[PDB]
């Protein structure tokens, strides 16, 4: 029975909820387990990056996040072809591939090609047969400076470009942002019936 002025609430505790309580005393021991399983991974892949392969510059979808840039799944096949990268040689030298990623845009396509010119120029490749050099492999001294990269390889920072201070021209001053919004709202909406009553007459 409710006492007085006080919030209405519906506690989700009507099931046998005590049997299925997940207590987090695993947590401090889990972080030890996940860390030892991360160092011993990195110690195996001895000169390779510890985060592993390079991820592409990728826009977030759905208009809340679409001004931000992530690390995606992997590079698209139209990003590997333009870079001169073979899709199955990509995985083996530490380049992320997914066959799924479309390309609706050229700038987001071209962003991930310049991304890969960096990597192949940054790539130190050790010969499979160590004591006999092969062609595509990097020089002897580049194998000797070879260290791991702790952190995501070519880390993705969202950068807005430097706009300067401008004297506002008599045209930009004169633009009516509110009415231009309110006009286009009606032109986006009512078009359907203005196309239909014009095809009529």
């Amino acid at each position: 029975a409710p006492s007085r002025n006080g919030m209405i609430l519906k506690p989700h505790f009507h099931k046998d909820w005590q049997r299925r309580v997940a207590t987090w005393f695993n947590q401090p021991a889990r972080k030890i387990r996940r860390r030892k399983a991360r160092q011993a991974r990195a110690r195996r892949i001895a000169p390779r990056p510890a985060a592993g392969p390079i991820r592409p510059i990728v826009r977030c979808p759905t208009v809340r996040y679409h001004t931000k840039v992530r690390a995606g799944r992997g590079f698209s096949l139209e990003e590997l072809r333009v870079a001169g990268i073979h899709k199955k040689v990509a995985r083996t030298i530490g380049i992320s591939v997914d066959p799924r990623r479309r390309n609706k845009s050229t700038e987001s396509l071209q962003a991930n090609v310049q991304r890969l010119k960096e990597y192949r120029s940054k790539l130190v490749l050790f010969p499979r047969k160590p004591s006999a050099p092969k062609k595509g492999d990097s020089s002897a001294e580049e194998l000797k400076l070879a260290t791991q990269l702790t952190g995501p390889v070519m880390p993705i920072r969202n950068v807005f470009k430097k706009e300067k201070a401008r004297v506002i021209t008599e045209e930009e001053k004169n633009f009516k942002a509110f009415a231009s919004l309110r006009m286009a709202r009606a032109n986006a909406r009512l078009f359907g019936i203005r196309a239909k009553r014009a095809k009529e007459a």
């Binding site: 029975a1 409710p2 007085r4 002025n5 006080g6 209405i8 519906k10 506690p11 759905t62 208009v63 809340r64 996040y65 001004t67 807005f160 706009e163 300067k164 201070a165 401008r166 004297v167 506002i168 930009e172 001053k173 633009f175 009516k176 942002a177 509110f178 231009s180 919004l181």
Partner: protein
């Protein structure tokens, strides 16, 4: 801390501070929000008006991304661009207005609440209020729409 609690002052006292006449019985008004229309009508009317009944249109697959439009006012608009710009654009004689990209700061609409200090601005915001435009134009600046 159990020692600081009330149970520690109720040892010796028979009823334990829950009445001697009306005994502390388990659920004497029903479990939870029972009798909201019947025997708790007055509590649910006096403090929770509108609780019972329907209103308006159902919208089945509603995502909170399509309806995302967070607002900055013209009050705190000069906080988004550093103190170094505001003084330089005031001090300089050329009349070059510093560009305030509102989409960069995280907001998609500029509303016109505050009194904007009298130096020209350029606002690259996505949506605008009518009053928000008038103040930017009133001081003497541009309302740049952005996609």
């Amino acid at each position: 801390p159990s020692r600081l609690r009330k149970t520690r002052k109720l040892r010796g006292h028979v009823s334990h501070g829950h009445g001697r006449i009306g005994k502390h019985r388990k659920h004497p008004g029903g479990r939870g929000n029972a009798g909201g229309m019947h025997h708790h009508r007055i509590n649910f009317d006096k403090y929770h008006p509108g609780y019972f009944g329907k209103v308006g249109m159902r919208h089945y697959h509603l995502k909170r991304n399509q309806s995302f439009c967070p607002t900055v006012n013209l009050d705190k608009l000069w906080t988004l661009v550093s103190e170094q710009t505001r003084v330089n654009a005031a001090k300089n004689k050329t009349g070059a207005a510093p560009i305030i990209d509102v989409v960069r700061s995280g907001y998609y609409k500029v509303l016109g609440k505050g009194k904007l200090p009298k130096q020209p601005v350029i606002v690259k915001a996505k949506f605008f209020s009518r009053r928000a435009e008038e103040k930017i134009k009133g001081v003497g600046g541009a309302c740049v729409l952005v996609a």
